[PDB]
From Swiss-Prot:
Heme binds at residue 48. It comes from Bradyrhizobium diazoefficiens (strain JCM 10833 / BCRC 13528 / IAM 13628 / NBRC 14792 / USDA 110). This is Sensor protein FixL. The gene is fixL. Residues 57-116 form the PAC domain. Residues 1-56 form the PAS domain. Putative oxygen sensor; modulates the activity of FixJ, a transcriptional activator of nitrogen fixation fixK gene. FixL probably acts as a kinase that phosphorylates FixJ. It comes from the Bacteria.
């Protein structure tokens, strides 16, 4: 599975997997109802509602159906690398997006270490 988050068309979290709680620091109850931008740092945080709105108006994906590696942010403030896949769905007429996260911290850690030892 890995971390999975579902948001409605406004970026508000509807479902947050147990694995996402483990990864982001927030529990289910706490996360649900919050905007998804609480999972990332600036400048993406303030800008995310616009990326979501730009997509809805242009129908031109930038991450949907491509994937992308980004910096996410846990509750205690630490930032970390993760791979992200976004899926589009529809329910009760309104759009919902699904995000599948893969923690890439260990990889970034193994990479910098191998680098520093020449
Ligand atoms: C948690 C760390 C995340 C970061 C840093 C991040 C960042 C971004 C960035 C940089 C863009 C588009 C910028 C561009 O290429 O124009 C974007 C688009 C979007 N993000 Fe996120 N995102 C995060 C998580 C999520 C999650 C968990 C969801 C869904 C559950 C999500 C849904 C969307 C949607 C729907 C769009 C627009 C779709 C598209 O442009 O393909 N994002 N995000």
């Amino acid at each position: 599975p890995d971390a999975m988050i579902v948001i409605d068309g406004h970026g508000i979290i509807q479902l947050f997997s147990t694995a996402a709680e483990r990864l982001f620091g927030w529990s289910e109850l706490e996360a649900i109802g919050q905007n998804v931008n609480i999972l990332m740092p600036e400048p993406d945080r303030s800008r995310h509602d616009s990326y979501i709105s730009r997509y809805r108006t242009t129908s031109d994906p930038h991450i949907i159906g491509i994937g992308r590696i980004v910096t996410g942010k846990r509750r205690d403030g630490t930032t970390f690398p993760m791979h992200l896949s976004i899926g589009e769905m529809q329910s009760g007429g309104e759009p919902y997006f699904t995000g599948f996260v893969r923690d890439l911290t260990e990889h970034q850690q193994t990479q910098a270490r191998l680098q520093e030892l020449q």
